[model samples]
Target chain A: CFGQCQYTAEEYQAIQKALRQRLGPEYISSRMAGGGQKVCYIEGHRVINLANEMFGYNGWAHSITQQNVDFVDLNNGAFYVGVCAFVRVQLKDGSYHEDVGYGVSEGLASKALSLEKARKEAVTDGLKRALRSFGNALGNCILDKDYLRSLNKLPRQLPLEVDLTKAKRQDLEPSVEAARYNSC
Target chain B: CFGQCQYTAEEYQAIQKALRQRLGPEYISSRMAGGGQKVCYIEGHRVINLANEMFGYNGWAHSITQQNVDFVDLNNGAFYVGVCAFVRVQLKDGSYHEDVGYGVSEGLASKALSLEKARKEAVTDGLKRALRSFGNALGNCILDKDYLRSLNKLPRQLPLEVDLTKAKRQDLEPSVEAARYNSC
Candidate 1:
């Protein structure tokens, strides 16, 4: 049971702008977020450094409390983003209220996909499957630990042999000069 | 300085839900927080029961490592919707990711909250925040101590206390029948 609630939308674009300016837009990706304030929770400590240098919440990068307001690279390494959802609620008095949300930011930097577009699409899909609707391999891994036992190592089983001969036609489709090797 | 991480949203959500259901909410309050999740990190032990029952993630709540998600709450009794905010994040992600969200089931219920309301709200916020935001207050209490202070306490110092009876009578609300005694 909840009570009277309202949300006031105050865009803390300062935090978001600061993060983008400081971290470099290349590193910042707003996959999904409602409004106001950048992610507050940070994972590991490296991202803290990035956040501290760029978006210092009045020297708060090291001391932010709302963990889910940010997300860290669960895949491990050194990057963090305050993860949290935002919602605008209307109270009976007609006043509105808003909130930030949180979640893990799964990345598919490298995968079985051969093309960057394919990989990005895969990453996007995988992220959705992992967090929203559960059922896929990754989703199952999260729901049932046993599934992970069999697949957790799948990603690491790398060292795949690249088939240079089977390169896509686009790889050789230059304006004028290009080479095409379609050998098996 | 951390390494890498890989946490599916499903797993994170399960852990968070478990934490809330087990803890029975009420643990996250402005007074209890005293600051951000960092300040409440010490309270992990208190939510052990919640963790065990819901997710079966036994042991210290703060000690939840790997794919586990952390949570934070922003409510301190008053105005039913005592729970004003929630944040969660996954631990393994190189950075926390997948922040979740939640809101009062009903304005009246959330505003005129009770002990049970506090528990339920806290649990909901806890679960979603953890799954979506990489967990909020649970582990990151170290940060946000200052920000936590910014979060206004519930029942907020009352925008203004109307004293309609001050001119008509006294003692707050004077029953119509009592008016005869005071009017004289």
Candidate 2:
């Protein structure tokens, strides 16, 4: 039996209602990422699991529409790689959305391994991003600028001050080093 | 006094000898980076400080040759931004090296802030990469694949298995959902 992936108006509305619901705070998590910055995010498994429950396993689909390594380099005294991916998510009701994702693997000694890691991460990231376009229930809420404010995760305006402690390579004018290094 | 940032062959050789020296375990640190990866790296401040000490403040310099936002996306239920930077490091003897660096800011509720963070991070990362090419004393030893093995940061081959825990949206055949949902 060939059945079309189609939904009636009423059925589609019901699905939309469920998909647009906001996620609970329990789903949110934060960690101190590279570059001395704190970051907030939800787990990859959690995102997929939630999508399964809400979209009814077979009701939605996603594919890696495109992927490529945008850049690779050594940084912070280690190896690093960055990947880009485009994912498309489609619902049973003949609706679809596509979005992009970026992934980075850093501080790894192996550049090839780092690139592979970044590629997979980009796919996962792209999938989540494409799904989020469906609505808050998928992940739009956490991306909102004010969402973290509601949770008090960011209590006040971030200081956002440029660190001036460690002088840069450009700031040296030859004299500073002559005085400083010769003194030693 | 305007010196042409010049160094004699003997002086240059001495600096090279110091920069190529292997770093001790104390200088290396590890942290859990994004995408469920453990990353080993040296601090940004430590890298710059070492360059100043080894090269003499005026003996070496770095500049951000190029900087740009490569990609920005939402993923894992959070926002992410990746930046690419090219840094050029030059020594007093007119010798130079240029390398790229990638910076990523993730899980930030604010995309704008994340972009800024990533930009500064790219500059730091690019500088470190460019400087590492100068020699080991500048932080090249840690970038060696076997270096982490000596420290036991990563002893065995990475499992690198694709996780199959949460079923993907693509796995469904449409029947899986229709049957289950109709039953309800």
Residues A48-162 of candidate 1 have per-residue lDDT tens digits of 2332332122222111122222222233532322233232222121211122223332344432222333323323332322111111111111222222233232333333365
Across residues B35-90, which tens digit of lDDT does each residue of candidate 1 receive? Answer: 55433332322222223223221111121111222222334532332333343332
Give the candidate number with the greatest lDDT.
Answer: 2
* Candidate 1 displacement at residue B39 in angstroms: 25
- What DockQ does model 2 achieve? 0.02
How well is each residue in A90-141 modelled by candidate 2, as lDDT tens digits? Answer: 6655577888888888888645346546765776677778878888888888
- Best by TM-score, which number? 2
Span of ten consecutive residues with least summed lDDT in model 1 chain B: B57-66
Which window of 10 residues has the lowest lDDT sum in candidate 2 chain B? B1-10
Ten contiguous residues minimizing lDDT sum, candidate 1 chain A: A132-141
- Residue A180 in candidate 2, Cα distance off native in Å: 11
Clashing pairs in 2: B19-B137
Off by over 4 Å in 1: A1-126, A129-134, A150-158, A169-184, B1-184
Residue B113 accuracy (lDDT) in model 1: 23
TM-score, one value per model: 0.19, 0.42
In order, the Cα lDDT scores of the candidates are 0.28, 0.63
> Could you list the CA RMSD of all candidates, in the order they appear?
27.2, 27.7
Window of ten residues with lowest summed lDDT in model 2 chain A: A162-171
lDDT of 2 by residue, B1-184 (tens): 2123444435544553454345655456679954587677877887887877776656677777677676676766666676767676765544454545667787788888888998888888778766665555566556444445555642333434657887575766787688778886
